[PDB]
Amino acid sequence: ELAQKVMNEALKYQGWKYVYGGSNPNTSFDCSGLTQWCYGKAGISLPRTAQMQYDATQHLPLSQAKAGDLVFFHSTYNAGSYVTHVGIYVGNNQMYHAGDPIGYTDLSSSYWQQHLIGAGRVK
């Protein structure tokens, strides 16, 4: 149920431009702004940053992940925190994320595999 609620919201922003600092439809979204907003619509309260969201979830490999789990990554840009990116797992090795434009990407790629930290299940 969670996945369908989060993604019904997230799909409204498919193709939108990434905006740094964005956390609502009025501004558009950054990676963890998209997840915070969409999970919020589904009744889950998440913290604002990708790192904070990582630390609020229970972790599991991508092979065990289910749609509606989050997926986290390291070393995607020059950051103080270990976690540098988050997106939404939607099954079949795909994630939906911001992302520029916002939308789907395939996690099977070497790039995502090598930046992967793991998946996280929300509380």
Per the entry, the structure determination technique was X-ray
Given CA atoms 53, 35, 104, 64 in this order, what sign does their dihedral have?
Answer: positive
Q: Using an 8 Å Cβ cutoff, are 50 and 83 in contact?
A: yes
Helix (H, G, I), strand (E, B) or coil at 43: coil
DSSP string, 6-21: HHHHHGGGTTPPB-TT
Q: CA–CA separation, 6 vs 8, rounded Å?
A: 6
The residue range of the domain holding 22 is 2-121
112: phi then psi, degrees, rounded to nearest 5: -70, -40
Whose CA is closest to 61, among 76, 74, 72, 49?
Answer: 72
- Looking at residue 20, which CATH number applies to its domain? 3.90.1720.10
Number of domains in the chain: 1
